Structure formats: C-alpha cells, structure tokens
DNA sequence: AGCGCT
DNA sequence: AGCGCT
C-alpha cells in the first residue's frame, strides 16, 4: 500500500 | 496481474 | 511495512 | 505466474 501501508495498485 | 498473469491492483 | 487470484 | 516503493 502507498508507499507506504503502491496503491494499490502500482 | 490479472488474475492471471488482481490488477494491477487488486 | 503492506493489496489481490484464477 | 505475475505489479509497485518510500
């Protein structure tokens, strides 16, 4: 997730 | 990806 | 440090 | 079987 805790997605 | 080859994302 | 399958 | 960081 994020960055940070990518996305998602990407 | 996909699903296949979730998403991006998910 | 933390998302999701067919 | 295959995406992406701050």
């Known amino acids: 997730t994020x ?3 990518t996305x ?3």
Chains 1, 2 share one sequence.
């Open 3 to 5: 960055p940070g805790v």
């Open 8 to 10: 998602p997605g990407v």
